[PDB]
């Protein structure tokens, strides 16, 4: 082929990734449906904050996908104890993620797998959403989804209650969890199970009421919980500013319709106030 294999990058139950001359190659039912999903979605998308599918190839029922080589990801940034995440760096990562998400939602696609290790960073400090293996188009009434999407630690309460139909709220809730991880350097809501994830959500943010979520009881897997008061947001994020706290509250609204979209989040005063986002060339490299 045209690619000389250079280095091994990872593997799993799904595929393996190699650095190759610089790009990254990810290699009776036929072609894998995850690979077909990624190919069919990334061909129709072009944005600096979305991973670019440069080429695809393979043989037989196997297939390989060629992407731009990505230097690191947000999970590595968060887990690195040497890295100091200034408010400017957090704003920069948040801004790039939200711009990519706004472009994605504008083309009626939900990522549905947002997490720090799916936000990849290159040598120029440009964040791109990756791992479109669970991404799906939304807005069609005659299209039933599954609630078992998004990693549990980043899954929205509507998903944990069995929502068959949802919108950008799942990605925005995952984005709020990612922001909380960036602030606290640890996962915000590490639930060992769906029930424990719901319990931690309700113990940190309070049990939703009828006024906070009008139709929450209509979800097929709705479970009544203790009347938790919840922790005040400024208690959890002691270093957060008022604008950042408003952004966090908008991202963590229990009502998915009331939850702030990517556009509304980008228009919030948090991204306009000083200091501005750190430029890509100055973002911390782990």
């Amino acid at each position: 082929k045209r690619y000389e294999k250079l280095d091994f990058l990872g593997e799993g139950q799904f595929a393996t990734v190699y650095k190759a001359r610089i790009v990254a190659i990810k290699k009776k039912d036929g072609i894998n449906r995850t690979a077909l999903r990624e190919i069919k979605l990334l061909q129709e998308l072009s944005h600096p904050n979305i991973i670019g599918l440069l080429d695809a190839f393979g043989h037989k029922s196997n297939i390989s996908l060629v992407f731009d080589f990505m230097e690191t990801d947000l999970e590595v940034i968060i887990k690195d104890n040497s890295l100091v995440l200034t408010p400017s760096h957090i704003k920069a990562y948040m801004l790039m993620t939200l711009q990519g998400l706004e472009y994605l939602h504008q083309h009626w696609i939900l990522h549905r797998d947002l997490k720090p290790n799916n936000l990849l960073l290159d040598e120029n400090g440009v964040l791109k959403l990756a791992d479109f293996g669970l991404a799906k188009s939304f807005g069609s009434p005659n299209r039933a989804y599954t609630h078992q999407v998004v990693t549990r630690w980043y899954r929205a309460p509507e998903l944990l209650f069995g929502a068959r139909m949802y919108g950008v709220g799942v990605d925005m809730w995952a984005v709020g969890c990612i922001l909380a991880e960036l602030l606290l350097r640890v996962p915000f809501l590490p639930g060992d199970s769906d029930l424990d994830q719901l319990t931690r959500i309700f113990e940190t943010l309070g049990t939703p009421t009828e006024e906070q979520w009008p139709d929450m009881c209509s979800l097929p897997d709705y479970v009544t919980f203790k009347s938790f008061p919840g922790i005040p947001l400024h208690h959890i994020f002691s270093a957060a500013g008022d604008d950042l706290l408003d952004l966090i509250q908008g991202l963590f609204l229990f009502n998915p319709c009331a939850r702030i979209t990517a556009t509304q989040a980008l228009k919030m005063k948090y991204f306009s106030n000083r200091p501005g986002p750190t430029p890509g060339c100055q973002l911390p490299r782990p």
């Binding site: 009776k28 039912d29 036929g30 072609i31 449906r33 077909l36 999903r37 190919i39 069919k40 979605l41 061909q43 129709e44 072009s46 695809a56 393979g58 043989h59 037989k60 029922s61 297939i63 504008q106 083309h107 009626w108 799906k136 069609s140 005659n142 299209r143």
Partner: protein, 279 residues
């Protein structure tokens, strides 16, 4: 979205002459490789067109009786795959039966219509051995089809643009009192358009609008005001003229369509079988 899609960027073509050039190129390449790998058995491009039309109707028949119910988007995607594949490929190299089945298979996967291989092949009216053979052929040709489609899998169909236009007519065009009376005939004209090459020459929005306006004209309704006033095209005379000419060309394509003749289809089927039995 269509306006920055691969369908518009790569699979919407300027003219029928460009499509004819592509198909003639494919036929000529297959002829040269066949005479360089070893005759009236060779198929002419128009015979290839007759076969492709017959097998697109066969693909429609396959998708209509498919169990569980096949979403119309899947059928449109599969037919678009068939047309795109045989733009640049000869039926003399890859048999249209296997290619159409592979098109349906890949369309089911791409559109997220979850169907397992056994229940897909169970729709074929053949024996379980024949179903296994067809499944193996489909699995062998799936990557070939993907490569020939240039890894452009998302297909924009005119059905959802049709829905949006009906919503717009209901909302902003009270002169058309019941737009729902322009659904059956408009969908019939949409199917007729799908029979032609218009899906490779015009946008899905243009196809949907042409179908709706043809349905209105059949009903004696003139919604030129809908284009001029509601779509504000009276503020841009050149744009309105361009759109009207696009619809007129689509109607011309529809009226000039010629269904394949059964006897001609049989003769060309014998020729195609002989071609595949050779080399």
């Amino acid at each position: 979205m269509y306006h920055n899609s691969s369908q518009k960027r790569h699979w919407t073509f300027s003219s029928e002459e460009q499509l004819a050039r592509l198909r003639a190129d494919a036929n000529r390449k297959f002829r040269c490789k066949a005479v360089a790998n070893g005759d009236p058995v060779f198929l002419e491009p128009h015979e290839e067109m007759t076969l492709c039309k017959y097998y697109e109707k066969r693909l429609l028949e396959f998708c209509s009786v498919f169990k569980p119910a096949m979403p119309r988007s899947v059928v449109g995607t599969a037919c678009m795959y068939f047309k795109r594949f045989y733009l640049n490929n000869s039926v003399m190299e890859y048999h249209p039966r296997i290619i159409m089945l592979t098109c349906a298979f890949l369309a089911c996967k791409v559109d997220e219509f979850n169907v397992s291989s056994p229940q897909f092949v169970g729709n074929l009216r053949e024996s379980p051995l024949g179903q296994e053979k067809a499944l193996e052929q489909i699995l062998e040709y799936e990557l070939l089809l993907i490569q020939q489609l240039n890894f452009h899998l998302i297909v924009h169909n005119p059905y959802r643009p049709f829905e949006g236009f009906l919503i717009d007519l209901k909302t902003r065009y009270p002169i058309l009192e019941n737009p729902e009376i322009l659904r059956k005939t408009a969908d019939d004209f949409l199917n007729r358009i799908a029979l032609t090459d218009a899906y490779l020459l015009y946008t899905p929005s243009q196809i949907a609008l042409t179908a709706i306006l043809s349905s209105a004209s059949r009903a004696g309704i003139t919604m030129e005001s809908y284009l001029s006033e509601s779509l504000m095209l009276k503020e841009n005379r050149t744009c309105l003229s361009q759109l009207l000419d696009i619809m007129k060309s689509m109607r011309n394509l529809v009226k000039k369509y010629e269904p394949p003749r059964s006897e001609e289809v049989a003769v060309l089927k014998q020729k195609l079988e002989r071609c595949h039995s050779a080399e």
